Amino acid sequence: NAMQRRLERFDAKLVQSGLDALLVTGQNNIYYLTDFWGTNATVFITKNRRLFLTDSRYTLIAKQSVHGFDIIESKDPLKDIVKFVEVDKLETIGFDNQVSFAYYQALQAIFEGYTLSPQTNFMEELRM
DSSP: OOGGGHHHHHHHHHHHHTOSEEEEOSHHHHHHHHSOOOSSEEEEEESSOEEEEEOTTSHHHHHHHOOSSEEEEOSOHHHHHHHHHHHTTOOEEEEETTSOHHHHHHHHHHTTTSEEEEESSHHHHHTO
């Protein structure tokens, strides 16, 4: 119930920011919203879902530790997120602007046809 309103702040911030979704990379950020600490999770939150994406190794760990999150076994998490975006018909995907430009180039390829929206410190307030 305590984390439940970091997750509810998150939702409100999505509305305020004009985003259908936010891709969250960074263990710190992932730790904040999930209580899972580790270096191979991706999070993808929309107005309606919360996805936690990891490999076959951390699925049980994560499947037990992480609450409020639909856990997805995945070895290409951006490929798996793309299905969601399509099925849910989302348009604007936020990402953290501290990603590298090379990483942004990978997002432009994977998400070609959608609007990528760079975010400044979105997670920063939530982390406060």
